[PDB]
Structure formats: structure tokens, C-alpha cells
Amino acid sequence: KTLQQIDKLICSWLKQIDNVIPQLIMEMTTETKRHRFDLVTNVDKQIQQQFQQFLATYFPEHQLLAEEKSNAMEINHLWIMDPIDGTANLVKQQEDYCIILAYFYEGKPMLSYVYDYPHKKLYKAIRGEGAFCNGIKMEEPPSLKLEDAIISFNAQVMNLDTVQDLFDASFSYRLVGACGLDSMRVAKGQFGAHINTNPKPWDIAAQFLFAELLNLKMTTLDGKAIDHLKGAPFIISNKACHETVLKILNANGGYQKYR
């Protein structure tokens, strides 16, 4: 059975990773992918590869869907990985990036991991036990109406009218700049909601479980329910401000650029 043992294994792999990264930084190399803002490093690739390796060693039946490798891909043990979510923050700030890891058994979220390596905070989620930040149990956050909550989203990728209407309806706006971590601030009850209008499946894979066990909302921007295997325009939200955010997003002909 237990997830609990697989979790001990995963957590001991993270301890391993913690000692590997300073080396990977030491010889850091930087490339761009499709455009000058789409960055990859040796850090991103080596973490992925090392889990690909871990998985082969201890879990050869298990498959891996992940950002820095091709995928293809009805699957029984699936891991989803963003080896460095927030690569732009790694490169420019050496701060505010994370590892995102999530395990799915017959489509159902079983374990989930967001590792804030720079602050040495490991958020984890385990079906049957709960969500934890470095061992302390995380509890359902207090209700947050939109009008009292801080929100996070990319303003660059939306028309300014609906950016305005979000500004007007919320307490304030902030942005960390990594899905995993803005999402975690919603979990921790510090942001009311996080939006990403075009995530990949690895950008959001761990959030399903956190959301389930901490009583958050996680949907498409049409309220629907997200296929973990493909992305979708998504939101993670306090329960008390979810409907309101989506309503504003879909108003006046939608959030899309131009207009």
C-alpha cells in the first residue's frame, strides 16, 4: 500500500537534490526555447533527468510527463513534473522558483510536492494525511471575499479593461512569478486567488490535491474541471472569492487581449 513510504522516498530524494543544486548553479548555463523570454538551464534539465533516473531505479512501471522532455503518453502510475517552475526568476533573481511534483494513480491525485528551494520550504500533499509545510499540517484557510483578498495573475497577457476590473474588485494585486508559489500563497491563505490563463499540465499538477484537501476551488476559467493530462486556462481560489473572479473574467466579452 502506503503512499506514506513512497513519500519518505520522495522526501529523501529532495534532501539529495538540496545538495546537488548549488553545484548546478555553480556551472549554470542558460538557453532560450521558442523566444527570448522562454528560458531553460542545466538546473531545469538535470533535476528532471535525475528524477527520470530515480523513477527508473525504484519505480520502472511509473511514467513521467515533464516540461523538458517530449511526451506521448490511459496510464496507471503517472508522475507530472515541472523541474524548475519559475525559470525566469531563477535566472534573473536566483529566488522565487520551485520544483513541482505530483503523483497520479489511475487519474487520481495521490501525492503532490511544491518545493520552495530558495526558502527551504517544502509544501507537500498526501491523500489520507493532509497538506504540510515542512512537517506542520496546513489547515483550510479562512474565507476571503475578493474585496478583502490580494490576487495574483499575469497582467501582461490580458486586456487592460479586465485587468482594471480585477484591480477595482480586489484588496490589492501582487505577483511572485511562479505558478507553484503563487498557488501556494492561495493555499496558505495569503492570496485569495491565483490565475494562469495558459498553463501547461506541470505548471498546475500538484495543485489538485492541495486544493482538494484544503477546500479550495481549482477550475477552468469556465468553472469546469481541468484535465490533469493537458493544461487549461485555470484558477486556484479561496472558496469565498471564486465565483466572483470568474464572473469578472468572463464579463464584457472576456479576458483575452484585444479587443
Add this chain to the structure above:
Amino acid sequence: KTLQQIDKLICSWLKQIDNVIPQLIMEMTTETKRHRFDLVTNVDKQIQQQFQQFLATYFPEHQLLAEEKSNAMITNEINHLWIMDPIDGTANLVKQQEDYCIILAYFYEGKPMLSYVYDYPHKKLYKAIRGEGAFCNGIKMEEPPSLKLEDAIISFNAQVMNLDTVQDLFDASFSYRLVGACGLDSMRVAKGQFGAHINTNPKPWDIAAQFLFAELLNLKMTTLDGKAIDHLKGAPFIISNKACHETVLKILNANGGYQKYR
């Protein structure tokens, strides 16, 4: 008294407020000021009170210009001046318990001699001592690498500018992030992690420390017109890497400027 003796006293009084803040947080109470979003807490108040008490107890003749008390005294002619934002980022403190800081700057006859931005939630004390340099927990900071704007993240408040100039800043910049406390957003510029941070209406206490960080680490710190800033008064302000400063100002001042109405 040797600044190193004064600094020893301050770092130490900042260090001890660690023991105090947790309990003040667990009894957090909140009042409003200019309007319902202009927040102040038991935390802001007690840290200021406890500093003023410290200053009376240790440098009787010095003076405190600070956020949560009136500053009618002054004016240009005071020898020993401290300026303090007891909690900068009060909104963040209330909502997140993270990304707030304490600002202090000592000025001897107008000239900044010591500066402190204490990032309490991650326990990172930033300090700058004239003659010594700038430090983060005693790890020494040096001038950052040149950052052109299109290679740089910027930080600013997108809600108080007209959405065209906002768009223009996005467009010309690598990306946008916001921490939401001036002192911390400023420090990211100081560390070279952001190319620049803008605040279009700071008070003296939101920017008091940064003068010296900027001088010692070769940053540009100016009004949104390029001129010197008078530390007794606010101005619309920027603090920047040297390579992106002119460009950010050009963008701000174009097509009637950065105000909602141009």
C-alpha cells in the same frame, strides 16, 4: 561615536525585535487612516514607540521623523535625524504575514550615514554603513551587473498609473513582478534581481534608507524627472540599475506622462 558603535547598537535593537514581533502578531489589531485601505496595526505602533524610547534612552539629542506620529518639528536644520517606517508593507503584513519590513535611516547634517531595511519575515537584515559598505546579514553586497530594461524585471504599482504607460513598461521590460513593500522591492533592485522599482508617491520614510544603498552600490535614485530627492519630503521616485534608468524615465514621461489623466 564611530558609526560602528552606533550600528552595533541598532543591529542589536533590530535583532531583539524578533522576540517581540511574534507576540504582537498573535494579538494583531487594525485601524484605518486616510481611508478604509490605509491600514495601521498594533505592530506598526509598538515598533515605533519602542524605537523612539530606544532613541531617548541612547541618543537623547537625535530626532525621529516617522510614519505613525506627527512630524511638525524639524526643519532643514537638524543635526541628527533618524527616519523610520516602522512597518513598511503593512497591507502585506496584515494579509500575508510576509513581504513587509522595517526601514530606518540615520542622517548627520543632511548626509546619510546609516541605513537599515530589515526583511523580518525571512530574517534578512540589510544594512549600509558609510565607510564600510552595504551588507545582507553581514554578507557584503557589491554593485550589481548592468541591466538593460529589456533584460530586466521591473516592479511598480500598476493601479495608480494610466494603463497605457503601464503597458509601455511591460512591453519594454523583461517581465513584471511585485513584492508590495517599497523597501523590499528597492532591495531587489539593490541586489540586482530587479532592474528598477517605481513609487509615484512615497513619503520620506518609504525611501529613507535607500539613498545610501544607492550611493554605495552605484544605483540611480531620482525623482521621475531625473533630479535629486530631498529626504525630508517625498517625491515621485525611481531607484534603478544604471543601464535602465534613463529608459524607464523616458517611458514614464512620454505621451503626457504616467498619471491616470494626462
